[PDB]
Write a protein that binds this ligand. Structure first.
Ligand SMILES: COc1ccccc1N1CCN([C@H]2CCCC[C@@H]2NS(=O)(=O)c2ccccc2)CC1
Ligand SMILES: COc1ccccc1N1CCN([C@H]2CCCC[C@@H]2NS(=O)(=O)c2ccccc2)CC1
Ligand SMILES: COc1ccccc1N1CCN([C@H]2CCCC[C@@H]2NS(=O)(=O)c2ccccc2)CC1
Ligand SMILES: COc1ccccc1N1CCN([C@H]2CCCC[C@@H]2NS(=O)(=O)c2ccccc2)CC1
Lengths: 472, 472, 472, 472
């Protein structure tokens, strides 16, 4: 009765073909879906790479043009330690902004005031932020402070093809000094794709930051690009307009077809399951809390459904980005990359049809639960070690400041990396604190030994036991 | 008779609940103790982090302000090789100290003489130490020396809102030159916590050190902070005065309750044990030297007692530190971190109640003795290698100077780290000493091979044998 | 009948010697072939090393002489950011070319015009490439561009024992600026071999590259040597003319003899096989699709034949290179190195004659298929991870730009290398993109854990199972 | 008969004590020998360390004083690229030598002429070496060269408490330029030991090396110390004269006693063996080629004899060094370190008396032969890979120049070190040679995979099989 139905439902594709029904249509559909998803991802990645290089090189040029005394490397630890140093840095930034068209190797254009910092007609705004009242006096031990940041800002307007040299900076109340301006470029490098009308607008922010009030003011330069269409389309675009959008709609249609087929199959499985519980109610025998009624389901279809949902949701956003006003590449790239990862993991299913590959897969499937329980135990011990190391070695070593950093350092240590650099960093404070040095010796030796000579060996033992159980 | 008593004593908590007695009160007490200890540690660590950053940034500013020709990095290998170089360094330090209020980006205050080096009214003291009699003469081979360090010191007093330029430095008898001064700051960064009255006093020591008499005088700058209350309290402190001290007394009370409960339980175990030895004296049978009468004890209660002792002893010192005159963070942080590590290791006990986690724990408990015996053997071989490597490769390579450094280098080598850097450091003296180069080749190859291909494999074999014994 | 024939065919060499036939002639021929191939490779490698050092040192001297502001290291990140910077770099290059004979520490000679860039009488040609029409205007959003690179070039002729200072560089249309010149040297270092008439001609190309149009123009110096005979032979060459060519013809003859013997043996095996299929047709029994009729063959003879083909094909090209007009060392070195690798792998055959070494070899031969199937599964998962990591972490981290680079980074990570450097590189953008930072944490932890604690353990399990099957 | 004798000969020390004979005299003698050898090694190492630091710091001071434009680091890649650069370097060296007493921070003394380069009265000799006849002409392709190095040298005599500025350097025939001078110092740092009369004499050699004739002349500074007694002894030496020599003679006597006891024991074993072969000749039974007659011997006594021979031979040389004219620390340190390594390995013998440690030792003793046979096979494959990698990647990457360097790089790669740095170094020439880049990809991936996933797994399998055989 239901015997033949469940037989066919649990048959492999080859035995299905042998018994009844036509060829592996869904299987070759999934093959072509793998192909189109990978090709789409590669096409997206090449263009993103070629635009990221342009953005980075323009930022490097901006740093070398506007930061005084800047040299490659040293992007951190670039600061000011003297009032004249800070004044010279600020005045150099503003003078280079005013001299840009005569000295720069690129071609930029000024942007007149159209936002919050820039008033009408101004292209650069240097704004300083201080406290409304501050009477810091390290002598007599009195400060008399009320934090309410006041902003006093100057606007500099550029010339066409003074009043900032009178800046007084209020060093004892200063919070930060910032410089805002914008520069329009044209990406001529886009003559390979012939999609040249990439017509950027960089927003440059130079920050002189005085939060810590340490006498050391770090200096930074961050930028933000805003891509557009540079009012000159369809010179070579007649041949490339159709290809990208047609490939995107092909991907969307293939993934929607895959989703509908897998939904049909999952509904079929659900109905067969509910038939089985009823007919087992008929004889009313071997029933338990029924956790295996969930084992009736097919996990590969769940994986496939998730992958096509992610693929179509990311392809919609890619369509929006590459032509329309969508500017959010992070989420789109995360969606597309996760979908491609899942699509490529879904080949393990085509490998479990053959006996030997199925042995190698069943070994891991059998070993996984013990691995996760051991991961619980090791989790708790490793978290204790992370807390102890953070709290003790934080004040002395910069690799142990954040909990994320101490976690990364320990995870690198249990795999053999930066081990002697860590040990030497600890060695560099023996004279400062012999007690902390001795604690660091005990801590590092104990942790590395316990986690390399006793935990990884047990992971190996678990996997080997699983392999032996499978091969017998 | 005693059968039911020992039954209940050795029952698990679930079977205890099933047989007689109320709920796991001690177990949930230990859970809330884990929680409060971890939260206290995190609260302490955040504030220590935020103060250590301030101290470090002020020290960096001091180095860049007072050391002549100083650049980031190069904190070692910063020295002087010429008399005019040393004179210019000293005079630059003193001139920057005198010019600080006009040039510094921070706000500091001078400290008039109140200690040993500083006489009345002086803020800076540059003191040179030489020998009482020294007639070093490399020619004729005569030195005629009697070491008795004499200190000749100058005091410079600062001005308010000369006599050191006449320094003669006695280069052939010099031991060191030092510069001592103090600077008062106010930690305005403490406006997040609103606990702003952190009103430091840095003690800066600039050392020109001539111990080796090599013609190379290294120059260093060390500082020491002395936190205080800056005579302006209770502006926002009304809301934060109670929270920290209340949390500390809550931790103290929870840990004292835990300690008393575990002491009750350990006394119970002792009395049951002494009852067992007597009733076994009654029948007078299966008695040996009685090492298992100690196996009657519960190690988890020992761990818990140690952890609460450490926690309360460290919380008392934290209470002393954060408000009173206690300034010793090293011991307090070590105590708190060790207590948190032990408290988080104490969850393994809650995992050994279930069968599968108990298998994973019993495997390690069974494998530990063989691991420690193999560690004895490997100890002796590794110590021989450390001695040989130190004595032979010490004179040529700086990674092999100290016994602690050669031990760290070898422990990193047996785990795959800095291996090629070590080999290349050895390669860099083939022309100097072919014999030492060949010895270093043999030494490094032999050690790494013997310790990677024969010792770690035996650790794996021990753990795998233990796992197989447990699973059968 | 055929029983004795197949007995002798499958006998080992020792049992062959015991039963019938003379000594291991082919085996000792292969031994002397190993010897001569290794000696030839070493002789070739020493001379290539000694010439590569000369080429590299001349290129370093060229960089320090012609690049303005160049310092060791910094071979990348050497660029120009200002019009005057670029002009000064170009003029410094040309002035140093004109001043070379008075300032250089080597001895070079000028090469008058004999090629495409250099017209008659000119030694240096500085050529700039721009667009035929370009109206880039970042303001108003208009570019009006048609890419057709026009080359405007200047020729500078050197003096014997002006007109380039009038260069205008067209910065808004520029593609690149190049400088071409040649310099003749004589390798006097070849007085050890006494093969001194190495009389080079370096072609130096200095590129000022403006592809990205970023405002940052990287500057590079590449060279190309062209070895010759410097019209002064046979001063010491009478003793060294014969040795190299005689050794090369000895290698050729030995490898041809080896090839002919192995071809005889393979034909013998083929004829015995075709006799076996016929006589099995006689009784007409245990026949299948006959995959073992291919197992009749000897793989070691295939390896040997390939190795002698590669050796003779590379020795012909080495003969051509070292005296004649052949200048292609890459292919010759690849051929010779592959042939030497195969010749040294062919000793495993001499080890499989003894029982214990044969056990160690048969273990690997039995474990190889499972290893390759697991490599298929791991291939697909690892490729999914590579695609996801490239697409997501490409825009932010330079180790993830190319697919080859992300593959190398992941392959290094699963073996414990640059792990914490990767983690810290990710940490450096938490403030920029918390979302990408969290994704990178999940990604790296998941990948390293899955590939270290579950895949390598299964490789170990496969090899251990194979060893246990072999030893029983 | 002989049964009781062989019983006692093969008894353990505890069973010997139980059966007949007094206490473990030889065993506690070996314990005190371990102690004295380790203490002697430590005492030697501390003093060698403290003198090596002085030598190194004086060399650093010499480099910073005499090399023009020298900065810490950059000890390689320090060269000259211009005639005026070389002239200025030479003249700066000589001027600093003449100005030393007025500018140096150490105290040095001039050494008048008493050797080969220095004639009478001269302290510094700058000598240039060129060819007797050289007509290098890169144009016309003619060199006309006969190598016969002629030395033209200048002598500069120092003043007391010109003619080198007229140097012409013959740049087209130059081989090298050298500068030789000596400086007497006094090690005042030896006031801790009070063994102050360490009265050195540094021989400084500054080499301007032009072997390659590349236009790049590297510049180096090497020194050589010559310790002496500085004509002022026995000021504090009355208390330290006896201790070192008494400890050295104690070590010599202890090691000679150990050697004589072990020689007695080995002769005893030989005589018992020769008795056994005779009495087995009596019954004339179970005799073979008799490899076990050598198994009659005790390897621990061989190890001990070698260790005491090395210890006494190195202690004689240490006695010679620390007071007499012996100046060869390399051989002495090698002897002492090897003897200490052997003495500390000799504790494994005291561990094999107990059953569990003996199991852990017997596992390794049983696994060693299979390990060595697998090492033969892996040897041959790894040597093939080394040859191929050297010959192919030598011309492009500096880590692959020497066979020793490629061997160190590969041995580091199979253990997970500098793997991504190697891969990136290869990546840096994709544009230069795509073919060599592709070969390097195949080469590195193949090697690392074959050696990590197939060879170390087999080492683990061998050790695990040995452990299982021992535990059953
Ligand atoms: C794909 O997941 C895995 C897949 C296969 C095996 C293990 C994991 N693991 C490791 C990955 N995760 C770690 C992330 C970083 C910190 C939190 C976890 N460290 S841990 O539990 O103290 C730890 C430390 C050493 C060894 C085993 C666990 C936790 C699951
Ligand atoms: C938590 O302790 C452990 C826990 C689990 C396994 C091993 C240890 N070990 C290793 C940690 N300790 C080492 C500290 C540094 C020097 C002294 C010891 N090195 S060793 O005995 O020559 C050595 C060298 C290689 C492998 C095994 C021992 C010694 C106990
Ligand atoms: C000599 O070949 C081998 C010999 C012996 C064992 C394994 C291999 N392998 C590893 C070498 N090859 C890799 C090259 C780089 C990327 C492509 C392959 N990576 S992988 O299949 O995702 C992978 C990742 C981790 C472990 C096992 C496979 C693929 C065959
Ligand atoms: C104490 O000796 C050992 C002790 C215990 C195990 C192994 C060795 N080995 C390794 C040490 N020696 C190596 C020196 C460098 C080059 C020559 C040899 N490399 S290898 O035979 O290709 C090779 C490569 C990978 C794994 C195993 C052998 C060769 C004996």
């Amino acid at each position: 009765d239901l015997r033949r139905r469940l037989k066919y439902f649990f048959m492999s594709p080859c035995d299905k073909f042998r018994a009844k029904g036509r060829k592996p249509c869904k299987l070759m559909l999934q093959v072509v879906k793998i192909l189109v998803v990978t090709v789409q991802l590669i096409l997206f990645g090449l263009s993103n790479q070629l635009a990221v290089t342009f953005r980075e090189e323009n930022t490097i040029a901006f740093r070398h043009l506007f930061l005084l005394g800047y040299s490659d490397g040293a992007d951190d630890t670039f600061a000011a330690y003297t009032r004249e140093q800070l004044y010279q840095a600020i005045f150099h930034a503003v003078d280079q902004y005013l001299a840009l068209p005569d000295v720069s190797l690129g071609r930029y254009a000024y942007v007149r005031g159209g936002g919050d910092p820039w008033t009408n007609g101004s292209g650069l705004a240097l704004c300083q932020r201080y406290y409304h009242r501050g009477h810091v006096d390290p002598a007599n031990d009195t400060f008399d402070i009320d934090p309410m940041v006041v902003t006093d800002c100057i606007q500099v307007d550029p010339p066409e093809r003074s009043s900032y040299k009178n800046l007084t900076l209020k060093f004892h109340k200063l919070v930060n000094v910032t410089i805002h301006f914008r520069l329009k470029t044209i990406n001529l490098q886009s003559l390979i794709n012939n999609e040249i009308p990439d017509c950027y607008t960089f927003s440059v922010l130079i920050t002189f930051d005085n939060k810590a009030h340490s006498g050391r003011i770090p200096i930074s330069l961050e930028t933000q690009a805003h891509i557009q269409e540079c009012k000159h389309p369809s010179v070579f675009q007649h041949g490339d307009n159709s290809f990208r959008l047609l490939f995107d709609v092909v991907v969307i249609l293939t993934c929607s077809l895959s989703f509908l087929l897998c939904a049909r199959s999952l509904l079929r499985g659900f109905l067969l399951q509910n038939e089985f519980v009823g007919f087992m109610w008929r004889q009313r025998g071997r029933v338990i809390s029924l956790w295996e009624r969930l084992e009736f389901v097919n996990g590969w279809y769940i994986l496939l459904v998730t992958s096509d949902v992610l693929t179509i949701s990311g392809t919609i956003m890619k369509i929006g980005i590459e032509a329309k006003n969508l500017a959010s590449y992070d989420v789109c790239s995360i969606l597309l990359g996760t979908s491609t990862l899942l699509v490529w993991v879904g080949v393990i299913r085509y490998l479990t049809f053959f006996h030997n590959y199925n042995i190698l897969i069943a070994t891991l499937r059998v070993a996984l639960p013990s691995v996760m329980r051991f991961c619980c135990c090791v989790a708790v011990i490793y978290l204790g070690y992370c807390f102890c190391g953070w709290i003790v070695l934080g004040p002395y070593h910069v690799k142990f400041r954040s909990l994320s950093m101490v976690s990364e350092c320990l995870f690198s240590l249990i795999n053999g990396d930066d081990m002697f650099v860590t040990f030497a960093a600890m060695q560099a404070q023996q004279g400062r604190s012999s007690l902390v040095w001795l604690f660091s010796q005990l801590y590092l030796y104990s942790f590395i030994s316990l986690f390399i000579y006793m935990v990884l060996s047990l992971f190996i033992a678990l996997i080997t036991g699983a392999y032996d159980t499978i091969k017998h």
